[PDB]
Write a protein that binds this DNA or RNA. Structure first.
Ligand code: TTP
Ligand code: TTP
Ligand code: CA
Ligand code: CA
Ligand code: CA
Ligand code: CA
Lengths: 367, 367
DNA sequence: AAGGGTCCTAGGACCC
DNA sequence: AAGGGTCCTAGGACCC
């Protein structure tokens, strides 16, 4: 029943990538820019008040020296993300990706294998690597403590390999399920790691100050919960199961109430190859003219290049748009003879276009 | 490029099943009844005017002696259907099911293997089994003719095994793709088979009298086509690709126009185990009372029994309803602890019920 | 008042 | 005027 899960979360991911390619940007407050948004920044820039997802206007207002590099093309970040996932896959094959810079690994089989190689002597010598959440005391006679400490040791090897082999720093969190691993990985956050022993699980979930900090409780779910007088984790822990069910759904309810107790039986999923390939362009209604075709052609070339280099081929294409004021989309299957190119593909999309501040294309249904 | 496909289609399937279990019902006009609908009938009953999908009222008006057996529980038909598919799977593993009584098999690899065992002597001795569509003359020096005749020979073995091993008769159609195999299988229809040589493909598609007879052109697509002045297969063959595209979709258009030429590159799919498990009950608004729970409990017991006997377990449940006057449905994931029962499951469904002439339950998302 | 199936679509909620 | 992802849902079109 008892699992040992690790959650890995890279430091200022995009900024770290740019800092690696241009070693200079180190020691200097660095922001990575996407249109008007400083999507992230390195930790220098955070000392000087810059925050993640901050308008470029406010970002300089706080840091007029902030160096900005453009991060609208994700290619280099996407490439590093998969190098990280591939490296962790060497440790244990079942690695679940979450976004570009997080990975879960179920270390359970691994922890168990390392224990069978030890004796009663080695067992009393087992030590933690990194922080223990809430400064909790360890009990070496507690098998669960021993296994989570072995997890912490695997997590440090992972982070060390990530640095030695890819030049990347990040955090790790080790716990008994994915929810808790992800919540504990951020407790000590610049390039460090934390392990959560079970006795401190309630301290961890009650350290949160609003329910949206629970992975799985988003903007909409949070809004509906405060509208019911639910604000703290304990409020959600103690709320009526029935009212919850019959307010936002038996699905949402029974799951986010379980989460509110630190419970989560979800398995670590093997993410494997991507399920989709998309690109976007945003603009200040900078498209009013069906010559919008050009934007779509540009998105095409990139996507076709990424697909070709993947190796599989998609069987569905989708076009997404946003109208000034809530996105809309039209998809259609891809014809057989095309699947084995620009000219046919753009004609497809323009008809999907004409059937209907942002333009996007998605290739999915990959085989 | 060139395939040899077989399409198998059982005679008066439900009626045949009932006739087997109760050998008496043979020689007697037999109708299988579902509420007010004689869903099918044996061929005796068809001589006397009974037709498939005919009200029981009209069915006796034509045949006041018509014996009727109730076919609302599909269990025995479902069981035979899979015995048929399993038998054809012995011939070639990739068998595609369509409904309960049709199967496609790609005989291409099989045909080719049998040819390599023959010599120029055996090649001039190759004969057809069954009918040749349109009485077309065979050219033994035509490799395509030879391969489709070998297909016709495999199709006769299949039908013979189906009879010797399962007591079931049906038709087969052999052609170069699934569309044409399915259209030619019905040309000689009580327990016979037909092979389509390529020179007669246009004769086959133009033998149809309305476009809805094309598999893939349904009620809605047909209605929209007649509304555009499209009525014959040739009308659809010759219609504007552009207008078609921009009237019902690049998907629907480019595909049903291809079909209208007898073209179809769709592969034979391995259907394998079912993707869902559902049951239904219909009634003359015989449910106005949330004691509708009982109907749902009854559907449950059966579905739980079928699932348990399958071996896999579902991860989604769905409830469907129809209101007097266009169906509606609510689904939700299945909780982990239940998946490994009646009481929890019915409570799930009643809340899905209350969130909302027919009641149905579906188990899908099987793992 | 059939009684089943397969697969696609537009959208939505969540994650980073 | 971010720029990406994963997965679910209610419905719809088709097949028998
Ligand atoms: C949340 C989020 C992340 N990202 C990108 C940029 C981030 O570098 C990357 C990972 O996001 P985060 O891990 O959430 O932030 P971070 O890695 O940049 O900084 P931290 O050290 O606190 O973890 O994903 C977006 O582009 N948009 C978003 O809304
Ligand atoms: C088309 C159809 C079939 N069925 C069932 C009953 C049929 O026995 C079975 C197969 O249908 P069909 O093969 O279309 O008809 P049939 O097999 O009964 O008669 P035939 O010899 O002409 O092929 O599926 C329905 O219940 N409802 C329907 O709408
Ligand atoms: Ca992160
Ligand atoms: Ca991060
Ligand atoms: Ca049939
Ligand atoms: Ca039939």
């Amino acid at each position: 029943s008892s699992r040992v899960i690790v959650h890995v979360d890279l430091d200022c991911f995009y900024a770290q990538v740019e800092m690696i390619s241009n070693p200079e940007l180190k020691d200097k407050p660095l922001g990575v820019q996407q249109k008007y948004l400083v999507v992230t920044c390195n930790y220098e820039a955070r000392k000087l008040g810059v925050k993640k997802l901050m308008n470029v206007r406010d970002a300089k207002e706080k840091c007029p020296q902030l160096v900005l590099v453009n991060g609208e093309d994700l290619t280099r970040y996407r490439e590093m993300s998969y190098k990280v996932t591939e490296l962790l896959e060497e440790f244990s094959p079942v690695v679940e990706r979450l976004g570009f810079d997080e990975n879960f690994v179920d270390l359970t089989e691994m922890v168990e294998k390392r224990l069978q190689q030890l004796q009663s002597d080695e067992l009393s010598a087992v030590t933690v690597s990194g922080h223990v959440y809430n400064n909790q005391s360890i009990n070496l006679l507690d098998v669960l403590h021993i296994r989570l400490l072995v997890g912490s040791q695997i997590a440090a090897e992972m982070r060390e390999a990530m640095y030695n082999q890819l030049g990347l720093t990040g955090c790790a969190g080790v716990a008994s399920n994915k929810l808790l691993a992800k919540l504990v990985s951020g407790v000590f956050k610049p390039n460090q790691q934390t392990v959560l022993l079970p006795e401190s699980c309630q301290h961890l979930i009650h350290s949160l100050n609003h329910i949206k900090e629970i992975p799985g409780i988003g903007y909409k779910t949070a809004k509906c919960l405060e509208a019911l007088g639910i604000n703290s984790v304990r409020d959600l822990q103690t709320f009526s199961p029935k009212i919850l069910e019959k307010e936002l759904g038996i699905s949402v309810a029974q799951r986010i109430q379980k989460l509110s107790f630190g419970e989560d039986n979800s398995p670590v999923i093997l993410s494997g190859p991507p399920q989709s390939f998309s690109e976007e362009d945003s603009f200040k209604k900078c498209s009013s003219e069906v010559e919008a075709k050009n934007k779509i052609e540009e998105l095409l070339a990139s996507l076709l290049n990424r697909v070709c280099q993947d190796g599989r081929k998609p069987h569905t294409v989708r076009l997404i748009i946003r109208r000034y004021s809530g996105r809309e989309s039209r998809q259609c299957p891809i014809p057989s003879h095309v699947i084995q190119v620009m000219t046919p593909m753009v004609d497809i999309l323009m008809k999907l276009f004409r059937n209907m501040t942002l333009l996007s294309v998605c290739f999915c249904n990959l085989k």
